[PDB]
Design a protein around this ligand. Structure first.
Ligand SMILES: CCCCCCCC/C=C/CCCCCCCC(=O)O[C@@H](COC(=O)CCCCCCCCCCCCCCC)COP(=O)([O-])OCC[N+](C)(C)C
Ligand SMILES: CCCCCCCC/C=C/CCCCCCCC(=O)O[C@@H](COC(=O)CCCCCCCCCCCCCCC)COP(=O)([O-])OCC[N+](C)(C)C
Ligand SMILES: CCCCCCCC/C=C/CCCCCCCC(=O)O[C@@H](COC(=O)CCCCCCCCCCCCCCC)COP(=O)([O-])OCC[N+](C)(C)C
Ligand SMILES: CCCCCCCC/C=C/CCCCCCCC(=O)O[C@@H](COC(=O)CCCCCCCCCCCCCCC)COP(=O)([O-])OCC[N+](C)(C)C
Ligand SMILES: CCCCCCCC/C=C/CCCCCCCC(=O)O[C@@H](COC(=O)CCCCCCCCCCCCCCC)COP(=O)([O-])OCC[N+](C)(C)C
Ligand SMILES: CCCCCCCC/C=C\CCCCCCCC(=O)O[C@@H](COC(=O)CCCCCCCCCCCCCCC)COP(=O)([O-])OCC[N+](C)(C)C
Ligand SMILES: CCCCCCCC/C=C\CCCCCCCC(=O)O[C@@H](COC(=O)CCCCCCCCCCCCCCC)COP(=O)([O-])OCC[N+](C)(C)C
Ligand SMILES: CCCCCCCC/C=C\CCCCCCCC(=O)O[C@@H](COC(=O)CCCCCCCCCCCCCCC)COP(=O)([O-])OCC[N+](C)(C)C
Ligand SMILES: CCCCCCCC/C=C\CCCCCCCC(=O)O[C@@H](COC(=O)CCCCCCCCCCCCCCC)COP(=O)([O-])OCC[N+](C)(C)C
Ligand SMILES: CCCCCCCC/C=C\CCCCCCCC(=O)O[C@@H](COC(=O)CCCCCCCCCCCCCCC)COP(=O)([O-])OCC[N+](C)(C)C
Ligand SMILES: CCCCCCCC/C=C\CCCCCCCC(=O)O[C@@H](COC(=O)CCCCCCCCCCCCCCC)COP(=O)([O-])OCC[N+](C)(C)C
Ligand SMILES: C=C(C)[C@]12C[C@@H](C)[C@@]34O[C@](Cc5ccccc5)(O[C@@H]1[C@@H]3C=C(COC(=O)Cc1ccc(O)c(OC)c1)C[C@]1(O)C(=O)C(C)=C[C@@H]41)O2
Ligand code: NA
Lengths: 479, 123
């Protein structure tokens, strides 16, 4: 059509994930490929693209379609003359044990739109991105890319970053207090280590600034409501604005460089919770922070700032001048601070006596403590009790995705890893295509068992079991 | 009585060893920021320039004995209060109310398991 969709595209567009719709979509999706080969065996139906350039496999991954995705990856057409359209190939079976070759042609970072890329980089307006990492050839592919060449690099990124915050702490702790900020450099062994510690701290601050600025502009354009999806990357960019903010103030002869550097230190150590994802039980703790600093704390700090600025306007209107730790509490800033201390647990009734009408002054403080210390802070605990029960299940789904983006970004950063990114490549011969040729398609492997049924298998690639680097193919193959 | 002491050995290795890593990031995060601010004597009296004292003065906000304006030897009062108010909201309001919710989930899990562990610890 005008959009570029063909028949196999439109069956994906008209899916809506319900188990009745998954039945007759994949049934009708099956019948067209076979009938495509009977009329046109020279045609390859699923290579075709629309004007966005997506294949019907990747279109099911770009949207949230899970049943159409689980079908195409686990696709075997058992009947002969149209078996080359399969994707899941069982290789041998020895009673219970059932070994299968999944296929990795369009997926696994080989092409322009691989479904491992398109799932992870999707803008979260498409649902069920977390669900689409549960299918079988993907969920054992990311787990088996982590166990070699990515666990070694991710532990090295976390070690260099911890050597960055020890240098940037110590170079800021021992800063000169003497005078105006472009400081001369004495010939000591102390000042050589310090000005080295500053140059290694600015150059780290440029690195987080450039990887920020390619994430927003050169790749991945992002709208304003998407900054709760890209939360973990926004914090590494705000840090690099303060650290480069100090270098402007440092050479502008301004003493306010210690007001921007310090917010980079406090945000520097705090962003070390970015690396505690990729660990399972640690990672569910830091997911709940980014889900409850935008949901439960931003709602609570609106209601709390109504009550605090409600009653601390009432109290300053009461208390008069000196009238006769001493301080004039007539400022609105002091009395908004003295009523914050009731929440913190350091709460001083009778903090002043410069008022008049003692009866209404105590009633205001006692109506404040019951509203704020007794009621809201015991409602916040109950509402976090409901939120943690909800995102107990969701956070396992978000953690697997936050493991997957690490694996993709490491592959894009190295060309020699891309020739090592062929996880279980093996370039295996699988079957026989039309025009009488070998298959030669990159294939993965898996193992299962079955005991409820008797495990009857119609087609088996290798008649003789096991994988000992020597096989003989079965005569079950037609050609 | 025995179901009470099983929950201690299951939550001094699971819930407290995870919490005391995140808490020691925030406490050593902000108490590095504060010592970099506060300058020398410049003119309960004490020199708060040590990292040990200021890591202790920010522990006291968790314990419920929390003194804002614990020093005045700094400069830039506006950034000193913002650091303390971003600390108290992060630590006293957010994490300690997340710890109560996460112990609420753990006790519901090991309510059933602890009857099973008690019979073994009797055996
Ligand atoms: C007194 C105390 C003693 C301590 C002495 C300290 C002196 C040494 C200090 C050194 C730190 C100074 C460098 C600053 C740059 C920042 C580095 C960084 O953290 O970024 C990355 C490093 O991963 C990389 O790819 C960059 C590698 C850095 C160059 C290596 C040279 C130093 C090696 C050192 C070891 C030599 C071993 C030799 C070989 C075995 C990791 O971060 P990221 O996760 O990629 O960024 C977030 C990504 N995100 C934005 C998408 C979320
Ligand atoms: C593994 C975990 C632990 C690791 C431990 C790591 C090392 C541990 C320790 C390390 C150093 C121990 C200190 C010895 C020297 C003390 C100096 C002194 O007494 O004079 C004075 C400094 O006045 C100066 O300007 C002199 C500068 C010399 C200090 C050396 C800088 C540190 C190295 C650069 C970084 C390395 C870069 C590496 C590059 C490759 C004393 O300073 P102050 O009175 O405290 O001023 C505070 C100012 N404030 C309160 C206003 C904020
Ligand atoms: C110069 C100073 C540099 C220091 C930093 C250099 C560090 C370099 C790297 C260090 C990495 C440490 C080695 C990890 C190797 C095994 C991984 C693993 O078992 O995965 C499991 C962890 O699952 C969890 O949730 C347990 C958490 C343990 C990891 C420790 C957290 C970070 C502490 C670090 C402190 C940083 C200090 C902060 C900054 C000073 C996940 O598998 P599972 O499904 O859960 O299976 C359960 C099996 N189990 C029973 C074993 C749990
Ligand atoms: C002088 C005047 C001061 C006040 C004017 C400033 C207000 C100007 C405008 C502000 C607009 C919001 C800015 C706050 C950032 C929060 C992020 C966000 O909104 O995205 C969240 C959208 O989900 C929601 O918005 C609903 C849940 C939070 C309610 C937001 C109310 C905050 C307004 C008062 C804030 C004051 C706090 C501090 C006060 C200083 C996404 O996070 P989530 O967890 O995925 O959402 C739940 C799931 N859900 C999408 C299915 C629903
Ligand atoms: C300067 C650098 C400082 C940091 C470097 C030190 C880190 C070096 C390495 C440390 C490795 C661990 C040592 C802590 C002892 C805990 C016991 C344990 O791990 O066994 C537990 C394994 O289960 C788990 O590990 C997952 C749940 C806890 C996560 C552990 C993170 C602690 C790392 C930060 C600790 C810092 C705390 C204090 C900070 C001073 C068994 O208990 P469980 O309840 O049966 O497990 C849950 C059930 N499960 C098995 C099914 C999952
Ligand atoms: C952390 C918060 C920071 C906030 C913002 C701070 C902003 C930036 C902070 C400070 C920048 C101010 C200094 C910039 C240039 C001055 C000259 C200089 O120092 O270079 C010197 C090398 O000094 C080195 O040692 C550089 C080594 C590079 C990295 C080493 C390991 C990699 C060389 O200088 P020179 O002219 O050749 O002198 C003759 C050599 N002589 C002295 C031995 C006789
Ligand atoms: C959260 C989104 C941030 C986005 C990135 C933006 C950051 C990138 C660039 C930054 C350039 C540096 C910032 C301000 C410029 C000068 C420094 C300064 O004056 O600090 C002021 C407030 O400074 C702040 O309050 C920081 C604002 C962030 C608040 C975060 C909430 C937690 C306080 O100092 P002062 O009192 O006004 O100075 C007067 C000195 N006198 C007291 C001696 C008279
Ligand atoms: C959890 C965090 C809390 C912790 C503490 C936070 C504390 C921060 C809270 C507040 C900031 C404190 C500073 C304010 C200034 C008061 C000081 C003073 O002396 O008064 C002065 C100003 O006079 C007034 O300010 C009158 C008050 C008008 C209130 C208008 C409401 C604003 C709506 C807001 C919506 C919020 C609603 C909430 C909904 C989200 C009078 O003196 P002056 O003579 O005019 O001086 C001028 C000198 N000159 C003439 C030479 C130029
Ligand atoms: C909302 C939840 C919390 C409610 C808590 C319950 C109330 C909280 C606290 C209440 C009493 C606090 C002050 C009492 C004594 C203090 C001394 C003082 O200076 O008071 C002065 C005025 O005070 C009065 O004597 C008038 C009492 C009016 C109280 C209104 C009760 C309705 C509250 C409904 C709720 C003088 O008092 P005096 O010098 O001692 O002599 C009395 C002379 N006279 C009787 C003629 C006036
Ligand atoms: C809940 C429990 C908390 C309760 C309180 C706990 C408090 C404990 C917290 C901390 C211990 C307190 C003691 C430290 C020493 C500071 C004192 C001082 O005066 O500075 C001195 C050292 O200078 C420095 O120490 C600079 C700071 C280096 C920071 C390096 C980061 C370490 C990473 C850690 C990873 C952790 C991250 C967390 C992740 C798990 C400067 O003075 P000097 O001149 O050098 O003196 C030498 C004299 N001489 C020259 C003759 C020999
Ligand atoms: C993140 C959650 C918590 C946020 C809580 C909210 C903020 C917390 C508290 C905020 C105010 C605390 C200090 C105000 C008065 C103290 C006296 C002082 O010495 O201040 C000095 C500098 O202070 C200023 O007057 C500059 C105000 C910059 C505040 C930045 C607001 C953005 C916070 C975004 C968040 C001088 O002030 P002054 O002598 O009184 O005269 C003013 C003269 N002038 C105006 C020309 C400079
Ligand atoms: C960019 C945002 C939205 C943000 C920037 C700063 C100012 C922040 O305050 C907030 C607002 C705020 C202020 C006070 C209390 C709660 C929230 O939340 C984060 C932001 C949030 C936190 C708390 O969250 C974290 O940093 C932990 C964290 C968890 C997961 C992550 O992936 C992560 O990034 C790696 C960081 C700590 C601060 O960054 C911090 O160090 C300081 C001084 C203030 C915190 O604004
Ligand atoms: Na108290």
């Amino acid at each position: 059509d005008s959009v570029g969709n063909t028949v196999l595209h439109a069956l994906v567009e008209v899916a809506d994930n319900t188990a009745d719709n998954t039945k007759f979509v994949t049934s009708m999706y099956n019948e067209i490929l076979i009938l495509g080969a009977k009329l046109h065996p020279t045609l390859k139906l699923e290579e075709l693209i629309n004007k966005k350039g997506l294949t019907p496999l990747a279109l099911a991954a770009s949207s949230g379609k899970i049943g159409v995705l689980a079908y195409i990856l686990q696709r075997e057409i058992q009947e002969p003359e149209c078996r080359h359209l399969s994707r899941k190939f069982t290789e041998w079976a020895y009673g219970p044990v059932h070994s299968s070759l999944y296929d990795l042609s369009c997926i696994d970072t080989c092409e322009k739109n691989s479904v491992l890329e398109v799932i992870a980089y999707s803008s979260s307006e498409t649902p069920n991105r977390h669900d689409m990492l549960l299918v079988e050839p993907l969920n054992r592919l990311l787990q088996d890319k982590w166990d070699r060449f990515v666990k070694r690099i991710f532990y090295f990124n976390f070690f260099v970053y911890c050597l960055y915050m020890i240098v940037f702490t110590t170079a800021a702790y021992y800063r000169p207090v003497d005078g105006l900020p472009p400081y001369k450099l004495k010939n000591t062994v102390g000042d050589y280590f310090r000005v080295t510690g500053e140059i290694l701290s600015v150059s780290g601050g440029v690195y987080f600034f450039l990887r920020g600025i390619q994430y927003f502009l050169q790749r991945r354009p992002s709208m304003k409501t998407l900054f709760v999806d890209s939360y973990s990357e926004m914090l590494f960019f705000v840090q690099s604005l303060f650290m480069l903010g100090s270098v402007v103030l440092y050479f502008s002869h301004r003493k306010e460089y210690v007001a921007s550097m310090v917010f980079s230190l406090a945000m520097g150590w705090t962003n070390m919770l970015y690396y505690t994802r990729g660990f399972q039980q640690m990672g569910i703790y830091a997911v709940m922070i980014e889900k409850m600093i935008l949901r439960d704390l931003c709602r609570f700090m609106f209601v709390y700032l109504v009550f605090l600025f409600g009653f601390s306007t009432a109290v300053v209107t009461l208390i008069e001048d000196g009238k006769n730790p001493p301080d004039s509490y007539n400022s609105l800033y002091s009395t908004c601070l003295e009523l914050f201390k009731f929440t913190i647990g350091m709460g001083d009734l009778e903090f002043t006596e410069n008022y008049d009408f003692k009866a209404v002054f105590i009633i205001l403080l006692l109506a404040y403590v019951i509203l704020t210390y007794i009621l809201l802070l015991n409602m916040l605990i109950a509402l976090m009790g409901e939120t943690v029960n909800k995102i107990a299940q969701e956070s396992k789904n978000i953690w697997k995705l936050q493991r997957a983006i690490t694996i993709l970004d490491t592959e894009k950063s190295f060309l020699k890893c891309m020739r090592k990114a062929f996880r279980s490549g093996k370039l295996l011969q699988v079957g026989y295509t039309p025009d009488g040729k070998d298959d030669y398609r990159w294939c993965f492997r898996v193992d299962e068992v079955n005991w409820t049924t008797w495990n009857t298998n119609v087609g088996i690639i290798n008649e003789d079991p096991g994988n000992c680097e020597g096989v003989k193919r079965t005569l079950s193959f037609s050609l």
